[PDB]
Amino acid sequence: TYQYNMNFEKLGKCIIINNKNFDKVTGMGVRNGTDKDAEALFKCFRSLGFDVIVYNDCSCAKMQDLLKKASEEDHTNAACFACILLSHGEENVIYGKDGVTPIKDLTAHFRGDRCKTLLEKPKLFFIQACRGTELDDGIQ
Amino acid sequence: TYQYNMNFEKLGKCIIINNKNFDKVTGMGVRNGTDKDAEALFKCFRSLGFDVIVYNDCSCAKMQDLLKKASEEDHTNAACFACILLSHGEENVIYGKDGVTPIKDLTAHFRGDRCKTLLEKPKLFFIQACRGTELDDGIQ
Amino acid sequence: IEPX
Amino acid sequence: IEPX
Amino acid sequence: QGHGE
Amino acid sequence: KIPVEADFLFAYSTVPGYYSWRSPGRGSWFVQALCSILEEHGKDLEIMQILTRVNDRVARHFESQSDDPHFHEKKQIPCVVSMLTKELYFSQ
Amino acid sequence: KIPVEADFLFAYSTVPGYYSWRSPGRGSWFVQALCSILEEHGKDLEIMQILTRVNDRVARHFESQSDDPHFHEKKQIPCVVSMLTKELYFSQ
Helix, strand or coil: CCECCCCCCEEEEEEEEECCCCCHHHCCCCCCCHHHHHHHHHHHHHHHCCEEEEEECCCHHHHHHHHHHHHCCCCCCEEEEEEEEECCEECCEEECCCCEEEHHHHHHHHCCCCCHHHCCCCEEEEEECCCCCECECCEC | CCECCCCCCEEEEEEEEECCCCCHHHCCCCCCCHHHHHHHHHHHHHHHCEEEEEEECCCHHHHHHHHHHHHCCCCCCEEEEEEEEECCEECCEEEECCEEEEHHHHHHHHCCCCCHHHCCCCEEEEEECCCCCECCCCEC | CEEC | CEEC | CCCCC | CECCCCCEEEEECCCCCECCEEECCCEEHHHHHHHHHHHHHCCCCCHHHHHHHHHHHHHHHCCCCCCCHHHCCCCCCCEEEECCCCECCCCC | CECCCCCEEEEECCCCCECCEEECCCEEHHHHHHHHHHHHHCCCCCHHHHHHHHHHHHHHCCCCCCCCHHHCCCECCCEEEECCCCECCCCC
């Protein structure tokens, strides 16, 4: 029909990457308030029925590997997949404590041809990070 | 409280840019079939209640002027605005008969601070154009 | 089929 | 507030 | 309108 | 105040970095699908519902055919970018 | 066959090229809103209905304040990118 099939043993896995501290060399500062987001997000997605896992202060390598391995797990029994990224960022990119890595490379692991058990299943990514430095002053 | 107010005298204006023939200098070929799209779109949006007008083989300057002027019209009695772009294109840009122009510059004219009469009203853009040269071979 |  |  | 599962 | 970027919706025929296919005798995939869905539900479905069915129609009903194997049996999926703050219906 | 890029959904806290705001005491705007809406409707609304309400909440109930005027009285609008081919509900 018109709705995704949700009749599975479980709703799915929810991966949370909570990056608060970064290496001095990146020029990025401490993201105070991020723990508050992670806590609320985890409680929230747990209530929805996801198997949530929270990772903290990950390097770019850790982020790629972590998601690559999640995409290699068997999701046959899950209805969907969710990933939340909390960190610094610029356009098309997200910061690891190490430096910068492309969002496209992070999500490519779950393409239909590289993660067959999530094929035809919704793959969600929530991203809290900047995408440049333009300001919206608003109107009215 | 959760829906856009549609109680206006007009649904809105609809601009369709139909680019079929391009200047040899651009190196782009003829987009056969684009006339079927344009006519199909015309009837459709017309049925919705839009006051649609079609502009053929526009130059980059023509497209910019078209969108600018439209943004300078009075939409006080319109529920929304719609624009459809049919042409060649690349990441972030779309072709005119004489070259490429940033899609961003075409849409910025409608920002809440540049078109007071569309503030809090939906501004819709439909784009049929390439965004790169990647191929999706599909799966299974 | 042709590309755009 | 701070930017991210 | 009416959105329903 | 209202963000100057609020209430915008972009319905792209394809995702960033990819090609977008067009049939010389039938028209582009994205438009064929869009028109058929609107002709049948433009008056009773919310904008996102309509565009989602378009995504599905394009992703399923279409598959390329070309002499050049590099363009043979190709697929496509549209891309919807919404900054809308409310639900949208073209009626009442 | 199904497009390799099909069935993805990206809920971005802000639009391309802009800042994203975070409160050291209450957390980022986007997340605050997201959790708030999910707590109340995560179990009975479609994913797009949810994110649209999230868009509306961030845009309306939030305006910055900072000693630095370049960061004072600023707004924000999230960005939803959908490649979903069906409607998504987190229940039944």
